[PDB]
Design a protein around this ligand. Structure first.
Ligand SMILES: Nc1nc2c(ncn2[C@@H]2O[C@H](COP(=O)(O)OP(=O)(O)O)[C@@H](O)[C@H]2O)c(=O)[nH]1
Ligand SMILES: Nc1nc2c(ncn2[C@@H]2O[C@H](COP(=O)(O)OP(=O)(O)O)[C@@H](O)[C@H]2O)c(=O)[nH]1
Ligand code: ALF
Ligand code: ALF
Ligand SMILES: [Mg+2]
Ligand SMILES: [Mg+2]
Ligand code: NA
Ligand code: NA
Lengths: 335, 341
């Protein structure tokens, strides 16, 4: 946005701004939700896509509640800020303090005896560099249960995640790590469970820098091995050591490119992965979702003509219309 | 491992048997089987652990489905027939002396019968290894559990692997080596998952934590190993098997045993744990736990001592002396395994 906001104003803001309000039903953008095993790097991937560090990452079980994020477009007031449902009248401008608030509110309802809840935390990020969009961070799938956590926890997480991911209007980010065999991927498992067609599922390969010497991801990345409707995108997020070093997101971006480029087995694929390519890819995908709608250029044509003697009338109405097409035709090859 | 379980299994039989000819007994079997199975998710390193336990390289490994069929190995100590060889049930009167080639035969026989390269089969491949140096045990290599299904695979295969593994695992005469990779979160462990199922008390289960050398920087396994993160009935044992690059350059068991013993005692978080890590330690922990099993048949000295004062109390008659000389040299042995374990 980048690409996607240009498209959005081109109607929703500036040129569907035309005459509405006579039974026009009805621009909902589908959510994007991360799924994958416990500690596959979901929170790291989601941050990267939003472009700022604001989600607790690490251990261990760290995301223990669904975190429903709504990005919100703002009257280009250079006034960027975040705000929680559970804390009205409180605005943040330091995403580290948002990150910290996410951790406290999560503790509030659980404890370091490591239980998960299904009641979401709601958070909004206001920005003129974003478009209206819900994003969803989720606790990772486990197989066991331990520390002290409930005995039921295993499928409680399985339903929580299923509860979001079921909805057809949900883009699924299936996060699988490259240091386990794909056959063992909880994320590939679940994203078949709910979206057999694999139609709204993008696959993300994390921890490529963590592979056993003698192995490499080339076969998965290059769609050789397990094949998806969309090409696998590989990422290198930052390490646990990098988390205690408080390495920042701009450093991690560089690092990530000093891997896909400086690694031999990967170089010929570099211009096609990293979190940035993934967000582009995500961008290009939802670009198609609203364009699919633009065959409402027929309801532009609805009026226009069948106005031509509706009484002069308005060469003015048929001036908006000119200017509507102006826009709904000056957004041709965005995808 | 063998050593002190052969020099106590042998310090018997030459006791119970070659003495307690109190006829009409019952009956040296059952827990003179306890099979040992490796379980865990695909490629968590089951085969590597198993051969480390046996002591010879003879099982294929990788990276991708490699093990695709149960491999039941009942190993054999010989009449000091000091000549190492093995034989596959499926091709009899065939003796192998090349172990690198026994390995080749496990794959071929797997390929021949699975059809596809990623297909599995619950038809066990029966192997025996003859070497007068290692005692009488059954070992069972098994395909790693998986979650999805890749490539040229069935579908139910997820359930087919679970079922197959579960079948050698439900039976109580079975030791589980629950094999868990350290570079994943223990909460996501398939090994631990099924082990705790078929063995809730955790009584016949050993936790093996592999791939400790692959841990992401800024994490280590000390908490798991000191028994703080997931308590088991027996201390966790960490191993470092050969990596896929080692395999590709054919690094051998001696160099991998050297490697491992250098890892633990050289990396500073593990140094304090070193000599309770390593597959050689695992094998020791295993033999000892078998020792306890047998040693738990020796309130049998009581099914002796009966034959005693019930005869120390009793033209050809007093001949006795001998069945008492023998049932007192059984004390030479069954009283020379005393402080063992
Ligand atoms: N080295 C490396 N570490 C990673 C990568 N991705 C995630 N991690 C680490 O994985 C652990 C869990 O990451 P997190 O984003 O919280 O995963 P989540 O529980 O799925 O949300 C942390 O210790 C991260 O440092 C990666 O690509 N490379
Ligand atoms: N670096 C490292 N690699 C390992 C370790 N254990 C196993 N591997 C690798 O993991 C892959 C699977 O090993 P394998 O013995 O076949 O495990 P299995 O398939 O469960 O029987 C091979 O590439 C091994 O070299 C370890 O401790 N460290
Ligand atoms: F272990 Al997490 F989100 F904290 F998968
Ligand atoms: F990954 Al395997 F036997 F090849 F568990
Ligand atoms: Mg998380
Ligand atoms: Mg195996
Ligand atoms: Na985590
Ligand atoms: Na494997």
């Amino acid at each position: 946005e980048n690409l996607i906001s240009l498209v959005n104003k081109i109607q929703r803001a500036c040129t569907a701004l035309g005459d509405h309000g006579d039974s026009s039903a009805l621009d909902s953008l589908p959510a994007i939700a991360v799924v994958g095993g416990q500690s596959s790097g979901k929170s790291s991937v989601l941050e990267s896509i939003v472009g700022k560090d604001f989600l607790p990452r690490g251990s261990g079980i760290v995301t223990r509640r669904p975190l429903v994020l709504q990005l919100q477009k703002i009257d280009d007031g250079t006034r960027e800020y975040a705000e929680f449902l559970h804390l009205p009248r409180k605005k943040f401008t330091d995403f580290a303090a948002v990150r910290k608030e996410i951790q406290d509110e999560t503790d509030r309802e659980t404890g370091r005896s490591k239980a998960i809840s299904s009641v979401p935390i709601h958070l909004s990020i206001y920005s003129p560099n974003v478009v209206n969009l819900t994003l969803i961070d989720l606790p990772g799938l486990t197989k066991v249960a331990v520390d002290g956590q409930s005995d039921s926890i295993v499928k409680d997480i399985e339903n929580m995640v299923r509860s979001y991911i079921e909805k057809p209007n949900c883009i699924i980010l299936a996060i699988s790590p490259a240091n386990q065999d794909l056959a063992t991927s909880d994320a590939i498992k679940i994203s078949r469970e709910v979206d057999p067609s694999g139609d709204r599922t993008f696959g993300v390969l994390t921890k490529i820098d963590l592979m056993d010497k003698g192995t490499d991801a080339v076969e998965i990345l290059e769609g050789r091995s397990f094949k998806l409707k969309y090409p696998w995108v590989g990422v290198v997020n930052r390490s646990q050591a990098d988390i205690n070093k408080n390495v920042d997101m701009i450093a991690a971006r560089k690092r990530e490119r000093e891997y896909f480029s400086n690694t031999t087995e990967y170089r010929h694929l570099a211009n096609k992965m990293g979190s940035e390519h993934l967000a582009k890819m995500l961008s290009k995908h939802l670009e198609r979702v609203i364009k699919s709608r633009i065959p409402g250029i027929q309801s532009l044509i609805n009026k226009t003509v069948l106005e031509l003697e509706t009484e002069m009338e308005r060469r003015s109405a048929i001036s908006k219309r000119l200017e509507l097409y102006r826009a709904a035709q000056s957004e041709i090859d965005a995808v």
